[PDB]
Amino acid sequence: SCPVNWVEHQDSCYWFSHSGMSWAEAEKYCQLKNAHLVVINSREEQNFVQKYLGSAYTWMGLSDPEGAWKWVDGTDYATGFQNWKPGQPDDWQGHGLGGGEDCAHFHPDGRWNDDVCQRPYHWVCEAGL
Ligand SMILES: [Ca+2]
Ligand SMILES: [Ca+2]
Ligand SMILES: [Ca+2]
Ligand SMILES: [Ca+2]
Ligand SMILES: [Ca+2]
Ligand SMILES: [Ca+2]
Ligand SMILES: [Cl-]
Ligand SMILES: [Cl-]
Ligand SMILES: [Cl-]
Ligand SMILES: [Cl-]
Ligand SMILES: [Cl-]
Ligand SMILES: [Zn+2]
């Protein structure tokens, strides 16, 4: 059902990187594989993904560059599953790299943070069946 190097869970296929990329390069990579950065739709999917994270910060398909949080596939953010770290998202500017923080990633414990999109983090692709 899933292609080789992809993991099947509950009607999605997932691919977990062994490397890091900026958020935009990871979403380009997922799109080239007819997929997208992972969209977390439920607690059960959050638990599956967080269980197999490669012990490093990992991008997901959630960003707010135009001002509101959006999932790459159009899943509604505000009515959807959320799993932020305490005090996140904060759009922090104190990194001094310019602007705030517009891309969401997993901490190893599975809780989410907004960070600078240009950081090379691991990522997860997802595609339907
Ligand atoms: Ca590898
Ligand atoms: Ca999903
Ligand atoms: Ca499961
Ligand atoms: Ca932001
Ligand atoms: Ca952490
Ligand atoms: Ca943050
Ligand atoms: Cl939350
Ligand atoms: Cl950013
Ligand atoms: Cl960095
Ligand atoms: Cl899809
Ligand atoms: Cl999907
Ligand atoms: Zn999808």
Which method was it determined by? X-ray
**Cited resolution, angstroms:** 2.0
Query: 14 Cβ partners below 8 Å, 6+ apart?
Result: 6, 7, 38, 49, 52, 124, 125, 126
101 annotated ligand-binding residue: yes
8 is known to lie in a ligand binding site: no
Question: What distances in angstroms separate CA 40 from CA 27, 54, 93, 106, 112, one per listed residue?
Answer: 15, 17, 26, 11, 11
Ligand nearest to the CA of 8: 3
Calculate how far, in angstroms, residue 98's C-alpha sits from the geometric centre of ligand 12.
Answer: 31
Q: How much of the chain is in helix, strand and coil states, percent to nearest 5?
A: 15, 30, 55
Task: Give the three-state DSSP class for 84.
Answer: strand
At 36, list the tokens: 């997208």
Which residue type is seen at 14? Y
For residue 58, the CA-to-ligand 12 centroid distance in Å is 18
* Residue tagged 């104190």 (tokens): 94
Q: Is 22 in a helix, a strand, or coil?
A: coil
Rounded to the nearest angstrom, the distance between the alpha carbon of 22 and the centre of ligand 8 is 10
